[PDB]
């Protein structure tokens, strides 16, 4: 959480 | 008492590439690749369940007002 | 600023159960940030480097993997190093990681180099772990001091006029290396533009040209972008990081681009190896892998 | 002209054991122990040099991933151009080397037999070809199996 | 099903140079696996048996040694048999071995018994030779059929309310026989817990209580764990297999435990005898030894 | 090889 997770 | 274990295993290396540009200066090794051993997950829990991007953003939003 | 003592305390845990903290003093860490900022600002924003060099990808606070990387690659100054960014966040030991890397920068400023990653940015590391770690272990003022330091990191390197290195990738706006060299520091990372792209973009096999990036920022670029860029600037290779890759390294556009990633079993969610790329005096490139034991 | 042979030899028995509990129901013979004869090592080679637990474990790790994938039969007519696919071996994990690979479709040639058919795509896993398993094989063994195929070629394909 | 024909062909090699294969058809071996599985499920997982009985330990695919064991011990149904597991792996003739035993289980289900060993487990016999033998002589689908069968084997037996038999040994978790009885089949063997321990544990003369096992799974138990168990359950003897013993049998904790191993010169790398234990109607226990000729 | 050879 996509910033990457 | 913990005792770290270090090692190295070699594996087949990069294949020879087909028709490279002659104008190219860098090249890639075809020698074996060294695979060095780091800690297993049992020895080293790399998880971090403390990370909470959504709550952080919320406080940050407020901080940028303060 | 007692550098040797600080480095000594950071390395003391080398034989320990991974996870053990090294708690430096607030003044030691502030001295590391201030001294390293003077060094970064005295060197160019686009580094001009020469082989031999070992190039490393993301670390993300995985302090004990960083120690193994040095154990196997050679502790400074036995080898020369270029890291491509993303030292902090995700991991539980961002502080020890960045502190050791700044110590080595200050100790060997012509043999050790750190590029800026997208996580060396306050709006990112505020939310992905680093602020929290600073707040817990020190105070939030320490976190602002790190921001001052990070805002001065160089953003790209060229190795022997042939390997272009940056954290993320290419930018549709990048036409001349003068566009990088004219960037003034300290600077934040903007939401768009050249500096953003360099730290955020990704290569994509499915795109012809520039595409939208699933990260919600910057772009993807295809293999023809890489070819054009390389031909234009008489370069041989792009070396970048930013994406987890199974083997620790992964080629793109034939062997015109390589992604490097140096955090093994990345934040305990992947089973990837880490890798570093060595470049020798003859410009021979090779890979060293760091793989978690079974 | 093999002639098997059997025999018995008695040896001293179990020693007497004093003070065992009176609540104990089972007991042990003191009678001589019969030692019967089986084959010599010359007659019966019990060695087995073919067991290799390291190779097997490497194959098994690969096999474990495959049976999470939904498997489906594909049949292609092999024409003059060939099968119209290229392949790539990938290991079960990071930097495994060359020995025990999964064989994936890397390329589906436009106009070729695989493409004209429709069911095979890039990243499909070739599980079986011509009744031969390609799970945990070398890329050269895979290539050999594929080039040796003729006429209507039977596949098992994995994806997802 | 063709059972007597199958048995005839399996026994046909009795006078041959050892090593000669018996190649039954795939449909034949499938039928043995499916029939015996129904039988195993219809009988209790904790077997309750009565003397007279002969008890054998590990076979490990040494087909010609099994034939000798029956020759000398009496072919079923002359003697009643309980085998303690480990029928497959290491030997070159696991298929003959398990097929003859399944055939006898099918023909004489109330006078012939088979327990599960740690090698009657896909994750072990995949690795130690059985899968390879199935792949070579038949196909891997047949190996899967055997797994379905082995998953239904009972786990332990009590002979005349006095002798507790299982492949490996005790479990720290075993307090009531009901814990064994409530285990549902088909089941795989877990890598920890009661079922694991019953198939994997070893006695150790050097441990007091429970110790770590050199195998990397389960536990070792000492002589007082044995004494306590027997006293608690009004049992006289633990009869187990799992470890090569030079004489084919070996007592532990005075005579409260016996280890039986029935594969002489095991996989051509040890020079041990095999043995079986006979239990007669009065509960007298005796040993018969199978020793390779010199 | 300990799994037991
Ligand atoms: Mn990163
Ligand atoms: Mn990044
Ligand atoms: Mn065994
Ligand atoms: Mn065993």
mmCIF file with all atom_site columns, N, CA and C in Angstrom, chain E residues 152-212:
data_model
loop_
_atom_site.group_PDB
_atom_site.id
_atom_site.type_symbol
_atom_site.label_atom_id
_atom_site.label_alt_id
_atom_site.label_comp_id
_atom_site.label_asym_id
_atom_site.label_entity_id
_atom_site.label_seq_id
_atom_site.pdbx_PDB_ins_code
_atom_site.Cartn_x
_atom_site.Cartn_y
_atom_site.Cartn_z
_atom_site.occupancy
_atom_site.B_iso_or_equiv
_atom_site.pdbx_formal_charge
_atom_site.auth_seq_id
_atom_site.auth_comp_id
_atom_site.auth_asym_id
_atom_site.auth_atom_id
_atom_site.pdbx_PDB_model_num
ATOM 1   N N  . UNK E 1 152 ? -5.043  -42.903 5.474  1.00 0.00 ? 152 UNK E N  1
ATOM 2   C CA . UNK E 1 152 ? -6.069  -43.622 6.216  1.00 0.00 ? 152 UNK E CA 1
ATOM 3   C C  . UNK E 1 152 ? -5.485  -44.703 7.119  1.00 0.00 ? 152 UNK E C  1
ATOM 4   N N  . UNK E 1 153 ? -4.162  -44.910 7.088  1.00 0.00 ? 153 UNK E N  1
ATOM 5   C CA . UNK E 1 153 ? -3.555  -45.928 7.994  1.00 0.00 ? 153 UNK E CA 1
ATOM 6   C C  . UNK E 1 153 ? -3.841  -45.669 9.501  1.00 0.00 ? 153 UNK E C  1
ATOM 7   N N  . UNK E 1 154 ? -4.073  -46.721 10.321 1.00 0.00 ? 154 UNK E N  1
ATOM 8   C CA . UNK E 1 154 ? -4.198  -46.408 11.774 1.00 0.00 ? 154 UNK E CA 1
ATOM 9   C C  . UNK E 1 154 ? -2.836  -45.986 12.313 1.00 0.00 ? 154 UNK E C  1
ATOM 10  N N  . UNK E 1 155 ? -2.821  -45.430 13.515 1.00 0.00 ? 155 UNK E N  1
ATOM 11  C CA . UNK E 1 155 ? -1.671  -44.738 14.044 1.00 0.00 ? 155 UNK E CA 1
ATOM 12  C C  . UNK E 1 155 ? -1.010  -45.492 15.177 1.00 0.00 ? 155 UNK E C  1
ATOM 13  N N  . UNK E 1 156 ? -1.771  -46.317 15.885 1.00 0.00 ? 156 UNK E N  1
ATOM 14  C CA . UNK E 1 156 ? -1.214  -46.976 17.038 1.00 0.00 ? 156 UNK E CA 1
ATOM 15  C C  . UNK E 1 156 ? -2.015  -48.234 17.317 1.00 0.00 ? 156 UNK E C  1
ATOM 16  N N  . UNK E 1 157 ? -1.440  -49.145 18.098 1.00 0.00 ? 157 UNK E N  1
ATOM 17  C CA . UNK E 1 157 ? -2.171  -50.372 18.499 1.00 0.00 ? 157 UNK E CA 1
ATOM 18  C C  . UNK E 1 157 ? -1.873  -50.682 19.943 1.00 0.00 ? 157 UNK E C  1
ATOM 19  N N  . UNK E 1 158 ? -2.857  -51.221 20.661 1.00 0.00 ? 158 UNK E N  1
ATOM 20  C CA . UNK E 1 158 ? -2.667  -51.776 22.004 1.00 0.00 ? 158 UNK E CA 1
ATOM 21  C C  . UNK E 1 158 ? -2.930  -53.270 21.952 1.00 0.00 ? 158 UNK E C  1
ATOM 22  N N  . UNK E 1 159 ? -1.909  -54.051 22.311 1.00 0.00 ? 159 UNK E N  1
ATOM 23  C CA . UNK E 1 159 ? -1.970  -55.520 22.280 1.00 0.00 ? 159 UNK E CA 1
ATOM 24  C C  . UNK E 1 159 ? -2.294  -56.046 23.678 1.00 0.00 ? 159 UNK E C  1
ATOM 25  N N  . UNK E 1 160 ? -3.422  -56.754 23.794 1.00 0.00 ? 160 UNK E N  1
ATOM 26  C CA . UNK E 1 160 ? -3.936  -57.280 25.051 1.00 0.00 ? 160 UNK E CA 1
ATOM 27  C C  . UNK E 1 160 ? -3.961  -56.303 26.243 1.00 0.00 ? 160 UNK E C  1
ATOM 28  N N  . UNK E 1 161 ? -4.282  -55.040 25.973 1.00 0.00 ? 161 UNK E N  1
ATOM 29  C CA . UNK E 1 161 ? -4.373  -54.011 26.996 1.00 0.00 ? 161 UNK E CA 1
ATOM 30  C C  . UNK E 1 161 ? -3.036  -53.799 27.730 1.00 0.00 ? 161 UNK E C  1
ATOM 31  N N  . UNK E 1 162 ? -1.938  -54.335 27.187 1.00 0.00 ? 162 UNK E N  1
ATOM 32  C CA . UNK E 1 162 ? -0.638  -54.266 27.861 1.00 0.00 ? 162 UNK E CA 1
ATOM 33  C C  . UNK E 1 162 ? 0.551   -53.740 27.035 1.00 0.00 ? 162 UNK E C  1
ATOM 34  N N  . UNK E 1 163 ? 0.502   -53.862 25.720 1.00 0.00 ? 163 UNK E N  1
ATOM 35  C CA . UNK E 1 163 ? 1.614   -53.399 24.909 1.00 0.00 ? 163 UNK E CA 1
ATOM 36  C C  . UNK E 1 163 ? 1.144   -52.287 23.988 1.00 0.00 ? 163 UNK E C  1
ATOM 37  N N  . UNK E 1 164 ? 1.687   -51.087 24.161 1.00 0.00 ? 164 UNK E N  1
ATOM 38  C CA . UNK E 1 164 ? 1.380   -49.936 23.328 1.00 0.00 ? 164 UNK E CA 1
ATOM 39  C C  . UNK E 1 164 ? 2.362   -49.857 22.174 1.00 0.00 ? 164 UNK E C  1
ATOM 40  N N  . UNK E 1 165 ? 1.858   -49.914 20.935 1.00 0.00 ? 165 UNK E N  1
ATOM 41  C CA . UNK E 1 165 ? 2.687   -49.954 19.749 1.00 0.00 ? 165 UNK E CA 1
ATOM 42  C C  . UNK E 1 165 ? 2.426   -48.735 18.897 1.00 0.00 ? 165 UNK E C  1
ATOM 43  N N  . UNK E 1 166 ? 3.499   -48.107 18.429 1.00 0.00 ? 166 UNK E N  1
ATOM 44  C CA . UNK E 1 166 ? 3.361   -47.046 17.448 1.00 0.00 ? 166 UNK E CA 1
ATOM 45  C C  . UNK E 1 166 ? 4.711   -46.895 16.769 1.00 0.00 ? 166 UNK E C  1
ATOM 46  N N  . UNK E 1 167 ? 4.755   -46.164 15.672 1.00 0.00 ? 167 UNK E N  1
ATOM 47  C CA . UNK E 1 167 ? 5.974   -46.160 14.894 1.00 0.00 ? 167 UNK E CA 1
ATOM 48  C C  . UNK E 1 167 ? 7.149   -45.466 15.609 1.00 0.00 ? 167 UNK E C  1
ATOM 49  N N  . UNK E 1 168 ? 6.900   -44.250 16.081 1.00 0.00 ? 168 UNK E N  1
ATOM 50  C CA . UNK E 1 168 ? 7.937   -43.405 16.663 1.00 0.00 ? 168 UNK E CA 1
ATOM 51  C C  . UNK E 1 168 ? 8.028   -43.553 18.171 1.00 0.00 ? 168 UNK E C  1
ATOM 52  N N  . UNK E 1 169 ? 7.088   -42.931 18.867 1.00 0.00 ? 169 UNK E N  1
ATOM 53  C CA . UNK E 1 169 ? 7.097   -43.003 20.315 1.00 0.00 ? 169 UNK E CA 1
ATOM 54  C C  . UNK E 1 169 ? 6.024   -42.142 20.943 1.00 0.00 ? 169 UNK E C  1
ATOM 55  N N  . UNK E 1 170 ? 6.304   -41.653 22.144 1.00 0.00 ? 170 UNK E N  1
ATOM 56  C CA . UNK E 1 170 ? 5.355   -40.886 22.924 1.00 0.00 ? 170 UNK E CA 1
ATOM 57  C C  . UNK E 1 170 ? 5.332   -39.428 22.503 1.00 0.00 ? 170 UNK E C  1
ATOM 58  N N  . UNK E 1 171 ? 4.321   -38.725 23.008 1.00 0.00 ? 171 UNK E N  1
ATOM 59  C CA . UNK E 1 171 ? 4.138   -37.308 22.801 1.00 0.00 ? 171 UNK E CA 1
ATOM 60  C C  . UNK E 1 171 ? 4.005   -36.634 24.156 1.00 0.00 ? 171 UNK E C  1
ATOM 61  N N  . UNK E 1 172 ? 4.609   -35.436 24.320 1.00 0.00 ? 172 UNK E N  1
ATOM 62  C CA . UNK E 1 172 ? 4.337   -34.702 25.561 1.00 0.00 ? 172 UNK E CA 1
ATOM 63  C C  . UNK E 1 172 ? 2.844   -34.419 25.711 1.00 0.00 ? 172 UNK E C  1
ATOM 64  N N  . UNK E 1 173 ? 2.122   -34.388 24.589 1.00 0.00 ? 173 UNK E N  1
ATOM 65  C CA . UNK E 1 173 ? 0.700   -34.039 24.599 1.00 0.00 ? 173 UNK E CA 1
ATOM 66  C C  . UNK E 1 173 ? -0.236  -35.212 24.853 1.00 0.00 ? 173 UNK E C  1
ATOM 67  N N  . UNK E 1 174 ? 0.279   -36.432 24.737 1.00 0.00 ? 174 UNK E N  1
ATOM 68  C CA . UNK E 1 174 ? -0.524  -37.634 24.978 1.00 0.00 ? 174 UNK E CA 1
ATOM 69  C C  . UNK E 1 174 ? -0.828  -37.948 26.458 1.00 0.00 ? 174 UNK E C  1
ATOM 70  N N  . UNK E 1 175 ? -2.073  -37.702 26.853 1.00 0.00 ? 175 UNK E N  1
ATOM 71  C CA . UNK E 1 175 ? -2.550  -37.920 28.232 1.00 0.00 ? 175 UNK E CA 1
ATOM 72  C C  . UNK E 1 175 ? -3.670  -38.930 28.331 1.00 0.00 ? 175 UNK E C  1
ATOM 73  N N  . UNK E 1 176 ? -4.385  -39.119 27.227 1.00 0.00 ? 176 UNK E N  1
ATOM 74  C CA . UNK E 1 176 ? -5.535  -40.026 27.151 1.00 0.00 ? 176 UNK E CA 1
ATOM 75  C C  . UNK E 1 176 ? -5.533  -40.654 25.795 1.00 0.00 ? 176 UNK E C  1
ATOM 76  N N  . UNK E 1 177 ? -5.793  -41.972 25.742 1.00 0.00 ? 177 UNK E N  1
ATOM 77  C CA . UNK E 1 177 ? -5.960  -42.702 24.473 1.00 0.00 ? 177 UNK E CA 1
ATOM 78  C C  . UNK E 1 177 ? -7.068  -42.107 23.605 1.00 0.00 ? 177 UNK E C  1
ATOM 79  N N  . UNK E 1 178 ? -8.043  -41.445 24.226 1.00 0.00 ? 178 UNK E N  1
ATOM 80  C CA . UNK E 1 178 ? -9.104  -40.813 23.444 1.00 0.00 ? 178 UNK E CA 1
ATOM 81  C C  . UNK E 1 178 ? -8.528  -39.732 22.485 1.00 0.00 ? 178 UNK E C  1
ATOM 82  N N  . UNK E 1 179 ? -7.388  -39.151 22.832 1.00 0.00 ? 179 UNK E N  1
ATOM 83  C CA . UNK E 1 179 ? -6.773  -38.161 21.948 1.00 0.00 ? 179 UNK E CA 1
ATOM 84  C C  . UNK E 1 179 ? -6.354  -38.773 20.620 1.00 0.00 ? 179 UNK E C  1
ATOM 85  N N  . UNK E 1 180 ? -5.954  -40.045 20.652 1.00 0.00 ? 180 UNK E N  1
ATOM 86  C CA . UNK E 1 180 ? -5.654  -40.778 19.430 1.00 0.00 ? 180 UNK E CA 1
ATOM 87  C C  . UNK E 1 180 ? -6.964  -41.168 18.730 1.00 0.00 ? 180 UNK E C  1
ATOM 88  N N  . UNK E 1 181 ? -7.924  -41.722 19.479 1.00 0.00 ? 181 UNK E N  1
ATOM 89  C CA . UNK E 1 181 ? -9.175  -42.206 18.877 1.00 0.00 ? 181 UNK E CA 1
ATOM 90  C C  . UNK E 1 181 ? -9.976  -41.131 18.136 1.00 0.00 ? 181 UNK E C  1
ATOM 91  N N  . UNK E 1 182 ? -9.851  -39.867 18.534 1.00 0.00 ? 182 UNK E N  1
ATOM 92  C CA . UNK E 1 182 ? -10.690 -38.826 17.954 1.00 0.00 ? 182 UNK E CA 1
ATOM 93  C C  . UNK E 1 182 ? -10.089 -38.222 16.675 1.00 0.00 ? 182 UNK E C  1
ATOM 94  N N  . UNK E 1 183 ? -8.870  -38.637 16.316 1.00 0.00 ? 183 UNK E N  1
ATOM 95  C CA . UNK E 1 183 ? -8.237  -38.186 15.082 1.00 0.00 ? 183 UNK E CA 1
ATOM 96  C C  . UNK E 1 183 ? -9.011  -38.754 13.896 1.00 0.00 ? 183 UNK E C  1
ATOM 97  N N  . UNK E 1 184 ? -9.440  -37.836 13.024 1.00 0.00 ? 184 UNK E N  1
ATOM 98  C CA . UNK E 1 184 ? -10.225 -38.155 11.834 1.00 0.00 ? 184 UNK E CA 1
ATOM 99  C C  . UNK E 1 184 ? -9.333  -38.444 10.631 1.00 0.00 ? 184 UNK E C  1
ATOM 100 N N  . UNK E 1 185 ? -9.690  -39.470 9.852  1.00 0.00 ? 185 UNK E N  1
ATOM 101 C CA . UNK E 1 185 ? -9.004  -39.795 8.617  1.00 0.00 ? 185 UNK E CA 1
ATOM 102 C C  . UNK E 1 185 ? -9.932  -39.629 7.422  1.00 0.00 ? 185 UNK E C  1
ATOM 103 N N  . UNK E 1 186 ? -9.390  -39.369 6.219  1.00 0.00 ? 186 UNK E N  1
ATOM 104 C CA . UNK E 1 186 ? -7.979  -39.199 5.871  1.00 0.00 ? 186 UNK E CA 1
ATOM 105 C C  . UNK E 1 186 ? -7.327  -37.972 6.517  1.00 0.00 ? 186 UNK E C  1
ATOM 106 N N  . UNK E 1 187 ? -6.063  -38.124 6.888  1.00 0.00 ? 187 UNK E N  1
ATOM 107 C CA . UNK E 1 187 ? -5.319  -36.984 7.405  1.00 0.00 ? 187 UNK E CA 1
ATOM 108 C C  . UNK E 1 187 ? -3.883  -37.039 6.941  1.00 0.00 ? 187 UNK E C  1
ATOM 109 N N  . UNK E 1 188 ? -3.290  -35.876 6.691  1.00 0.00 ? 188 UNK E N  1
ATOM 110 C CA . UNK E 1 188 ? -1.841  -35.784 6.520  1.00 0.00 ? 188 UNK E CA 1
ATOM 111 C C  . UNK E 1 188 ? -1.180  -35.775 7.907  1.00 0.00 ? 188 UNK E C  1
ATOM 112 N N  . UNK E 1 189 ? 0.138   -35.968 7.970  1.00 0.00 ? 189 UNK E N  1
ATOM 113 C CA . UNK E 1 189 ? 0.881   -35.874 9.215  1.00 0.00 ? 189 UNK E CA 1
ATOM 114 C C  . UNK E 1 189 ? 1.334   -34.415 9.380  1.00 0.00 ? 189 UNK E C  1
ATOM 115 N N  . UNK E 1 190 ? 0.984   -33.773 10.512 1.00 0.00 ? 190 UNK E N  1
ATOM 116 C CA . UNK E 1 190 ? 1.428   -32.384 10.675 1.00 0.00 ? 190 UNK E CA 1
ATOM 117 C C  . UNK E 1 190 ? 2.879   -32.342 11.100 1.00 0.00 ? 190 UNK E C  1
ATOM 118 N N  . UNK E 1 191 ? 3.504   -31.178 10.970 1.00 0.00 ? 191 UNK E N  1
ATOM 119 C CA . UNK E 1 191 ? 4.901   -31.072 11.343 1.00 0.00 ? 191 UNK E CA 1
ATOM 120 C C  . UNK E 1 191 ? 5.071   -30.822 12.830 1.00 0.00 ? 191 UNK E C  1
ATOM 121 N N  . UNK E 1 192 ? 3.957   -30.736 13.558 1.00 0.00 ? 192 UNK E N  1
ATOM 122 C CA . UNK E 1 192 ? 4.007   -30.709 15.028 1.00 0.00 ? 192 UNK E CA 1
ATOM 123 C C  . UNK E 1 192 ? 2.720   -31.187 15.694 1.00 0.00 ? 192 UNK E C  1
ATOM 124 N N  . UNK E 1 193 ? 2.850   -31.668 16.927 1.00 0.00 ? 193 UNK E N  1
ATOM 125 C CA . UNK E 1 193 ? 1.694   -32.120 17.673 1.00 0.00 ? 193 UNK E CA 1
ATOM 126 C C  . UNK E 1 193 ? 1.619   -33.627 17.822 1.00 0.00 ? 193 UNK E C  1
ATOM 127 N N  . UNK E 1 194 ? 0.541   -34.087 18.447 1.00 0.00 ? 194 UNK E N  1
ATOM 128 C CA . UNK E 1 194 ? 0.376   -35.495 18.842 1.00 0.00 ? 194 UNK E CA 1
ATOM 129 C C  . UNK E 1 194 ? 0.703   -36.494 17.728 1.00 0.00 ? 194 UNK E C  1
ATOM 130 N N  . UNK E 1 195 ? 0.062   -36.332 16.583 1.00 0.00 ? 195 UNK E N  1
ATOM 131 C CA . UNK E 1 195 ? 0.234   -37.266 15.469 1.00 0.00 ? 195 UNK E CA 1
ATOM 132 C C  . UNK E 1 195 ? 1.683   -37.295 14.956 1.00 0.00 ? 195 UNK E C  1
ATOM 133 N N  . UNK E 1 196 ? 2.261   -36.103 14.800 1.00 0.00 ? 196 UNK E N  1
ATOM 134 C CA . UNK E 1 196 ? 3.651   -35.963 14.470 1.00 0.00 ? 196 UNK E CA 1
ATOM 135 C C  . UNK E 1 196 ? 4.542   -36.768 15.422 1.00 0.00 ? 196 UNK E C  1
ATOM 136 N N  . UNK E 1 197 ? 4.424   -36.515 16.734 1.00 0.00 ? 197 UNK E N  1
ATOM 137 C CA . UNK E 1 197 ? 5.225   -37.185 17.774 1.00 0.00 ? 197 UNK E CA 1
ATOM 138 C C  . UNK E 1 197 ? 5.094   -38.702 17.775 1.00 0.00 ? 197 UNK E C  1
ATOM 139 N N  . UNK E 1 198 ? 3.880   -39.205 17.627 1.00 0.00 ? 198 UNK E N  1
ATOM 140 C CA . UNK E 1 198 ? 3.679   -40.651 17.588 1.00 0.00 ? 198 UNK E CA 1
ATOM 141 C C  . UNK E 1 198 ? 4.463   -41.305 16.457 1.00 0.00 ? 198 UNK E C  1
ATOM 142 N N  . UNK E 1 199 ? 4.675   -40.570 15.359 1.00 0.00 ? 199 UNK E N  1
ATOM 143 C CA . UNK E 1 199 ? 5.376   -41.064 14.167 1.00 0.00 ? 199 UNK E CA 1
ATOM 144 C C  . UNK E 1 199 ? 6.874   -40.681 14.120 1.00 0.00 ? 199 UNK E C  1
ATOM 145 N N  . UNK E 1 200 ? 7.279   -39.728 14.940 1.00 0.00 ? 200 UNK E N  1
ATOM 146 C CA . UNK E 1 200 ? 8.609   -39.131 14.810 1.00 0.00 ? 200 UNK E CA 1
ATOM 147 C C  . UNK E 1 200 ? 9.538   -39.190 16.034 1.00 0.00 ? 200 UNK E C  1
ATOM 148 N N  . UNK E 1 201 ? 8.986   -39.401 17.237 1.00 0.00 ? 201 UNK E N  1
ATOM 149 C CA . UNK E 1 201 ? 9.771   -39.202 18.458 1.00 0.00 ? 201 UNK E CA 1
ATOM 150 C C  . UNK E 1 201 ? 10.703  -40.377 18.718 1.00 0.00 ? 201 UNK E C  1
ATOM 151 N N  . UNK E 1 202 ? 11.720  -40.181 19.552 1.00 0.00 ? 202 UNK E N  1
ATOM 152 C CA . UNK E 1 202 ? 12.742  -41.192 19.824 1.00 0.00 ? 202 UNK E CA 1
ATOM 153 C C  . UNK E 1 202 ? 13.026  -41.231 21.316 1.00 0.00 ? 202 UNK E C  1
ATOM 154 N N  . UNK E 1 203 ? 13.254  -42.427 21.874 1.00 0.00 ? 203 UNK E N  1
ATOM 155 C CA . UNK E 1 203 ? 13.819  -42.476 23.232 1.00 0.00 ? 203 UNK E CA 1
ATOM 156 C C  . UNK E 1 203 ? 15.276  -41.998 23.300 1.00 0.00 ? 203 UNK E C  1
ATOM 157 N N  . UNK E 1 204 ? 15.640  -41.323 24.383 1.00 0.00 ? 204 UNK E N  1
ATOM 158 C CA . UNK E 1 204 ? 17.035  -40.885 24.572 1.00 0.00 ? 204 UNK E CA 1
ATOM 159 C C  . UNK E 1 204 ? 17.498  -41.114 26.013 1.00 0.00 ? 204 UNK E C  1
ATOM 160 N N  . UNK E 1 205 ? 18.529  -41.946 26.168 1.00 0.00 ? 205 UNK E N  1
ATOM 161 C CA . UNK E 1 205 ? 19.022  -42.358 27.477 1.00 0.00 ? 205 UNK E CA 1
ATOM 162 C C  . UNK E 1 205 ? 19.719  -41.199 28.182 1.00 0.00 ? 205 UNK E C  1
ATOM 163 N N  . UNK E 1 206 ? 20.010  -40.151 27.422 1.00 0.00 ? 206 UNK E N  1
ATOM 164 C CA . UNK E 1 206 ? 20.733  -39.008 27.944 1.00 0.00 ? 206 UNK E CA 1
ATOM 165 C C  . UNK E 1 206 ? 19.814  -37.875 28.370 1.00 0.00 ? 206 UNK E C  1
ATOM 166 N N  . UNK E 1 207 ? 18.534  -37.962 28.021 1.00 0.00 ? 207 UNK E N  1
ATOM 167 C CA . UNK E 1 207 ? 17.583  -36.941 28.453 1.00 0.00 ? 207 UNK E CA 1
ATOM 168 C C  . UNK E 1 207 ? 16.780  -37.375 29.687 1.00 0.00 ? 207 UNK E C  1
ATOM 169 N N  . UNK E 1 208 ? 16.507  -36.413 30.555 1.00 0.00 ? 208 UNK E N  1
ATOM 170 C CA . UNK E 1 208 ? 15.548  -36.572 31.644 1.00 0.00 ? 208 UNK E CA 1
ATOM 171 C C  . UNK E 1 208 ? 14.292  -35.782 31.211 1.00 0.00 ? 208 UNK E C  1
ATOM 172 N N  . UNK E 1 209 ? 13.144  -36.459 31.097 1.00 0.00 ? 209 UNK E N  1
ATOM 173 C CA . UNK E 1 209 ? 11.937  -35.812 30.555 1.00 0.00 ? 209 UNK E CA 1
ATOM 174 C C  . UNK E 1 209 ? 11.948  -35.658 29.033 1.00 0.00 ? 209 UNK E C  1
ATOM 175 N N  . UNK E 1 210 ? 11.606  -34.470 28.542 1.00 0.00 ? 210 UNK E N  1
ATOM 176 C CA . UNK E 1 210 ? 11.486  -34.215 27.100 1.00 0.00 ? 210 UNK E CA 1
ATOM 177 C C  . UNK E 1 210 ? 12.610  -33.330 26.526 1.00 0.00 ? 210 UNK E C  1
ATOM 178 N N  . UNK E 1 211 ? 13.176  -33.752 25.391 1.00 0.00 ? 211 UNK E N  1
ATOM 179 C CA . UNK E 1 211 ? 14.299  -33.032 24.796 1.00 0.00 ? 211 UNK E CA 1
ATOM 180 C C  . UNK E 1 211 ? 14.043  -32.690 23.345 1.00 0.00 ? 211 UNK E C  1
ATOM 181 N N  . UNK E 1 212 ? 14.934  -31.890 22.757 1.00 0.00 ? 212 UNK E N  1
ATOM 182 C CA . UNK E 1 212 ? 14.858  -31.553 21.329 1.00 0.00 ? 212 UNK E CA 1
ATOM 183 C C  . UNK E 1 212 ? 15.314  -32.783 20.542 1.00 0.00 ? 212 UNK E C  1
#
